[PDB]
Symmetry: D2
Subunit: 389 residues, 4 copies
Amino acid sequence: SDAEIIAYKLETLIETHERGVSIRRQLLSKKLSEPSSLQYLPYRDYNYSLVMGACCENVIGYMPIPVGVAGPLCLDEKEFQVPMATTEGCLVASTNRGCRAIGLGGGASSRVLADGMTRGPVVRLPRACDSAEVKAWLETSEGFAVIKEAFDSTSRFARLQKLHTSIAGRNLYIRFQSRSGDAMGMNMISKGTEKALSKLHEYFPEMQILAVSGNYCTDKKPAAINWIEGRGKSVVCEAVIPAKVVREVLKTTTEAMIEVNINKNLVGSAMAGSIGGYNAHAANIVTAIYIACGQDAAQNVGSSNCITLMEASGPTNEDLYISCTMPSIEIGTVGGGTNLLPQQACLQMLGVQGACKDNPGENARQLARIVCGTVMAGELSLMAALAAG
Amino acid sequence: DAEIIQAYKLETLIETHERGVSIRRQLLSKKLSEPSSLQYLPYRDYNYSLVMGACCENVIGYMPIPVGVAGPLCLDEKEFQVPMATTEGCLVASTNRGCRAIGLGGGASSRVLADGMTRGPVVRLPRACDSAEVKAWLETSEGFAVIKEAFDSTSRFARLQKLHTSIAGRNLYIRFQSRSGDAMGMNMISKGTEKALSKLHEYFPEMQILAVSGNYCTDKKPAAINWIEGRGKSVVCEAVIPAKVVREVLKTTTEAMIEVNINKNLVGSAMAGSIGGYNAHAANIVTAIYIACGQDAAQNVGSSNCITLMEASGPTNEDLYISCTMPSIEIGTVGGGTNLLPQQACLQMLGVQGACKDNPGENARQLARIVCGTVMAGELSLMAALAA
Amino acid sequence: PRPNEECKFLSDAEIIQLVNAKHIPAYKLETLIETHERGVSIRRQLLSKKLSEPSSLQYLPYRDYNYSLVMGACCENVIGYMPIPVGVAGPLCLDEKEFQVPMATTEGCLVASTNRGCRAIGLGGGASSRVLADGMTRGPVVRLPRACDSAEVKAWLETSEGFAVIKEAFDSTSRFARLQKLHTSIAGRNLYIRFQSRSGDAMGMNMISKGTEKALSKLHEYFPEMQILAVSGNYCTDKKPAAINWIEGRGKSVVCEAVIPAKVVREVLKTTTEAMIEVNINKNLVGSAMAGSIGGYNAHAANIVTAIYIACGQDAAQNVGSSNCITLMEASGPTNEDLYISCTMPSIEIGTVGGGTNLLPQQACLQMLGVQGACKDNPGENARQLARIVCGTVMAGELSLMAALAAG
Amino acid sequence: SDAEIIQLVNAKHIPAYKLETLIETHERGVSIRRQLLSKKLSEPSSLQYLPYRDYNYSLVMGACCENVIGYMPIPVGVAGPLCLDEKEFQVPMATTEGCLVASTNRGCRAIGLGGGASSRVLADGMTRGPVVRLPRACDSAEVKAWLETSEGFAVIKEAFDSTSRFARLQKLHTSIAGRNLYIRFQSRSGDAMGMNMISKGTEKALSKLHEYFPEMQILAVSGNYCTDKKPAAINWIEGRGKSVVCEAVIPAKVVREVLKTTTEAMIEVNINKNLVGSAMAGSIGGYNAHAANIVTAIYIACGQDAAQNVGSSNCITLMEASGPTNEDLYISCTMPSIEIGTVGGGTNLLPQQACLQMLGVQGACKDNPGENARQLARIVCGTVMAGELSLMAALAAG
Ligand SMILES: CCC(C)(C)C(=O)O[C@H]1C[C@@H](C)C=C2C=C[C@H](C)[C@H](CC[C@@H](O)C[C@@H](O)CC(=O)O)[C@H]21
Ligand SMILES: CCC(C)(C)C(=O)O[C@H]1C[C@@H](C)C=C2C=C[C@H](C)[C@H](CC[C@@H](O)C[C@@H](O)CC(=O)O)[C@H]21
Ligand SMILES: CCC(C)(C)C(=O)O[C@H]1C[C@@H](C)C=C2C=C[C@H](C)[C@H](CC[C@@H](O)C[C@@H](O)CC(=O)O)[C@H]21
Ligand SMILES: CCC(C)(C)C(=O)O[C@H]1C[C@@H](C)C=C2C=C[C@H](C)[C@H](CC[C@@H](O)C[C@@H](O)CC(=O)O)[C@H]21
Ligand SMILES: Nc1ncnc2c1ncn2[C@@H]1O[C@H](COP(=O)(O)OP(=O)(O)O)[C@@H](O)[C@H]1O
Ligand SMILES: Nc1ncnc2c1ncn2[C@@H]1O[C@H](COP(=O)(O)OP(=O)(O)O)[C@@H](O)[C@H]1O
Ligand SMILES: Nc1ncnc2c1ncn2[C@@H]1O[C@H](COP(=O)(O)OP(=O)(O)O)[C@@H](O)[C@H]1O
Ligand SMILES: Nc1ncnc2c1ncn2[C@@H]1O[C@H](COP(=O)(O)OP(=O)(O)O)[C@@H](O)[C@H]1O
Ligand SMILES: Nc1ncnc2c1ncn2[C@@H]1O[C@H](COP(=O)(O)OP(=O)(O)O)[C@@H](O)[C@H]1O
């Protein structure tokens, strides 16, 4: 009976997933200064089977995030209705206005420049001379192949690319980079890396593997390395907004937009000492789409890297040319939070849910292009509001 | 529903909020390649009244994020049950293990070092000589007083603490820093900044206000200025984990934890060219708590700034001393997403919901201390897993 | 060559043999030998043996140099001097004055290029400059038993009464030592304190270090458990790139500006205002952004800073932070024909008194600019003037290089 | 006579910088320029102490400097011997900062008594990062992809490699910013620092690229993506010039007797100053105590480009407790971007060639091109380590 059972060791004891959640809440309530705190924290009628043992632990319910829609987004001759999970007012409306200006401008074009999730472990040799020897070995075409072999043998999608190594005395940081089908790829690349390091330990028995991640990836921390070499998907997007569209939809001029972009996104960011933060609010857009689509929201740290550029275009130089370059969009359409039904619905809205069996990785690339496009719409709108004052 | 279809202004016309959403979902399905997708996106039985006109537009439903609990967190002689909204496996469990090690260690201590949300507008003058003149005026006690007088006149909770100005030729970037009670403060600081710039314009007519935000705040973009001068709440957290607790709960040694922290969080981050990213995964913890508590998750960019330090402690130097310093936690307990009931529930769990009537700001400071403490628990756990 | 027992005025070969035998270190040759140049000569001969090529030094000068000013002040184990070609760029029309700028360098085209830049500025009606801030810094690192204690010290240092006792201790060390403010940063139980103060006409490193040591003693009386780990915890920050110098400044923060008429851009610079602007934005702003630069938003300010620093006896290693600069260009005038240019340098570490400025040749270069030594009437004015000159010369240099990049 | 030549100039019929070609002797040209400059000064006798007599200006005029009015004497001191890679070096240091040479000398002493230092060159390649523009981001994206294929690379490599004897194009790193494309060219350059050589190779390579993409606009041969003489994370992360690492172990006894401190005190200072302190200051590549002091002193003495001390001084200094009882001091210095050369520029002058000869690296290495420059870079990293050891000890000893 309910009261007779009277934490994580609940789903294993009982049988029904919701029962265990309900018991944990009642248990928790006794340990709080306000037992009625959880009154308004919903938990009923939720599919906990997909969550248990894959996405969360010690579950006591779920947090509802308002989902809005911005669009249509005219990108690469297609139209997208973009789902955005946010609690910030004006965000969805503002982004929507941006999409409008792009559509009335003939749409936006985007390109995926690079694709590759990374993992940067740190190993240490007894002496720097030894670590230097390993670096040189890793750089020989013969040393690389054996490493790519041990790395690729862990998965169908594990296809190791370039190897970026860096030395700090007897320490050696190795940045592994590989595609990962339609998955964001963190778990996959970690597995490949472990196998690859094990193989390297056989050639250099004196090598000590200090940590599978030595912050050289770099994952969820700001880093110049992600900005300069990319991580995940590097994307670029562009569009031209007609002078009339800038005055009527955005309520400003091409000249004012350009002056704000240069002195805010370029000079202002420079004065603030920014690395990769040469935009107005890409993070707002990235975060909203990530939460709605089951992405890892903590990856918004590097995923939001962006340089927004604006310039006079057209016959009379009265048209607004805009481009957004995002070198490190960490994203996926398979695994993690994308395995849940509500987030899968948002992914389906964009036509990128799950794997693309015929062209592996295409769904994730499409999603990355959508994010870059939506960021551009968001940048257009906020810059206009700042310019119009 | 029939010929009602004959846009965002639905609840502006129709009666029920849930009906206005149902209809918006119907209008949208006609533009989708897979109209059946919306079937799994919930929307039923949710208080949209609090959302409409405040937190979101063009609403088509809501996204459920699994909420887990980590704790108890023994911090400043209190115990906290920490709500974490996440879809990443092992996160809540790992953080929970970290809390365990801290409690068995006698708990953690934290201090709020600074408190002040910022806004950094960019203005321009005719010549660099003029912008230099404005900078000099702004740095006098008389000049600051008038600016402060005008800034503080916009709110009861808006109190200008200082000004930091930088010029770039004829451009002048002014960083306004102010307390904001229990609110994260962006809107409040923006209002005060507009009023202050208006007053500055009266002293310098030839001044052009280019943008209320010139990226000098800096908001939601990585910037050395937030790391060096702070933004929102600057917090420091510490704890000592006994040798046996490291061995038994964390499954490693103090020596291995220290070697991993130095070569990963310090040297590794240095090699990667990081500014403010001298930690293992503070962003994971910050994000999870932010989503659960109705914070602005996009502020995870600067809020996650953290330097994790580990040292040998005790009589025999077998104990693990750990500290986490987070100079820029942007947080609040009133307004924005904290106005919604489910997120208010998570805030209530921590005893920091809404405004602290007695001492405005105490709830937000408490929440910031809780975040720094939870990050430290998270850092302990992940470093242990990496060392082992 | 007399025996060692028999051995001021002797034979060179005899001194050498004495050095080898009594194992006397070469650096004692100044306080053992008669004329200054002989001590050097002997050391050159002493070192000449250790070389795989004994005749290496043959072309390294040493004769006819004032070693008295150098010994015990600017260099040790002296074996001669390195001649750096000095060129002149000018006149530089700045703040309604004209300057003939000395530049020590071995890089071809630098002086010529900078000279062309000065020409364009003069024909443009000159340049205007302003000193925005002045204050050398030192950022020591101290430790407390706990983060809670370091937090307590930070709060204490932020009270008006706490700051006053520190300021009193700091200022009691020198006439020009005047503590301006305190920026304090915590990293767990560690506490980094950035001291900032004016220093008359001196660059001020030694002076600020002395003040800092005294102030930390006073602080130690209030917090006996405080451990002073290092008088410099890299929070100054001295001779290393750092966002803190860029954002808060160090030494002298300066801004310079000038408008180059379209006519002058076409004829002297061989390009257009539009091309210059496009190069500046995509190189100095966007390019530097893509490269992950902090404070390097310019074309080659380091070239100019270094050349003037070596010629004027400044500390050339300080070129690391001193070269921080953001170069901005934009359309100006009736028909947006003219080129508006500005250079903002937040951290020029400079001085006209002390260190290498005490030597005669570099004093000559300082005299050329009218800023040699201390300003008796207005302490610090000579150093501020020199900083303004450097910013102005950098702008001239930026104009010229940008033009060469834009044209061809 | 001089009086006559001066009156001719004050007639506007000669600028003043035409003297070397106008006159016969170089030194007299300098003398006349000095007299002319004197009348324009608020204090005419100010040049009194600026030397100029008896200096081989032939090697300078037309190659190293313009409008020459004399020379600036920089005191040269010697630090050593530096026990590095089983060799001994007497290191020349041009400086006006007191205690620098002495301090570095003490550092060398501690290293020698510890069994010497070992160093390795990890990478070698000068760079140039021009910026070009295409009509659209889609076009710049197409060029990036093209440059990434084997065909496009070989074509660019061939054109680059055809400009010089040492032009051997390696990796081609590229970055896009909308319709802008930044291309980082990297190549070895024998024993030369290589700026001019790489610039020449870059110009032709861009010509060849223009034939395949006629709509491409070459905005600047240098778009600050090299990056030359400005602080940049790209040089720290990918290197520029020579990447070097050096290491040594100092016995507990030597740390106590020579450095006047303990290994424990050293380690605590290094971590909290060079790592944590630099982190708090927001440094990129400045994880050392004073590598710039050593780099600058050696650069000036050896005819290097002193302005390159901006990136050349990038360094991470690491210290660790080593040995039987963990009382021995292990130290390492990693410098990813030492821009250096032993041929060309200021190294063409006799006085600086003398300093280079002192180290045995003057000019070209006939047998193995580049070896002299690599040796010099190793010497710089080693001397930096000796300098780091000494300053850290002084900071530790209170
Ligand atoms: C800070 C600028 C501004 C316009 C005053 C502001 O408050 O507008 C709010 C309220 C309303 C007016 C309209 C808006 C339109 C678009 C955006 C979603 C914007 C919020 C932007 C904010 O989330 C991030 C910025 O602070 C980044 C920056 O530009 O520095 C939002
Ligand atoms: C990060 C490498 C590692 C430990 C193999 C890993 O996969 O552990 C996973 C699974 C399990 C083992 C235990 C864990 C404990 C704590 C964390 C929530 C961790 C996920 C880390 C990830 O969210 C970010 C890191 O990649 C950041 C970094 O340390 O560079 C998580
Ligand atoms: C920068 C490339 C370029 C213009 C082709 C070049 O070789 O010009 C040389 C030779 C001659 C043409 C004219 C010049 C004019 C002005 C400067 C002193 C320049 C050399 C600058 C160099 O020392 C640093 C740059 O490389 C910095 C940058 O990236 O802009 C110098
Ligand atoms: C900053 C150190 C200290 C002790 C205050 C100082 O004045 O020592 C001077 C005088 C004497 C004591 C011994 C010394 C030994 C070695 C060096 C050449 C040092 C000058 C260092 C200075 O040129 C750069 C540092 O300031 C960098 C930093 O550590 O932040 C020099
Ligand atoms: N599923 C989980 N949910 C929450 N916390 C967990 C979970 N699994 C482990 N933990 C935490 O991690 C610690 C590890 O203990 P345990 O799970 O028994 O594993 P171990 O074999 O490492 O001892 C526990 O003290 C608990 O706080
Ligand atoms: N204790 C409190 N602290 C802060 N704001 C409070 C408090 N009590 C009430 N408020 C109200 O809440 C407002 C802050 O919310 P909001 O306008 O959304 O701005 P912000 O962007 O700062 O959250 C204040 O202007 C004030 O009217
Ligand atoms: N050899 C040089 N030495 C010094 N300055 C030079 C030299 N060559 C050119 N300059 C500078 O460049 C400017 C331009 O002169 P020049 O190159 O002859 O072109 P033009 O005479 O066509 O304007 C001169 O006013 C001078 O400042
Ligand atoms: N003027 C100097 N020139 C060169 N080296 C010096 C000088 N002063 C000190 N040293 C270095 O310091 C070492 C010894 O330090 P210490 O025992 O304090 O004696 P002292 O300071 O008299 O040399 C010497 O071996 C030498 O490397
Ligand atoms: N061993 C060598 N190493 C380098 N350069 C050499 C060598 N032998 C001859 N050279 C010549 O010297 C040139 C390098 O000097 P220079 O053109 O002044 O450029 P930099 O000073 O920028 O390296 C090479 O392009 C080549 O013509």
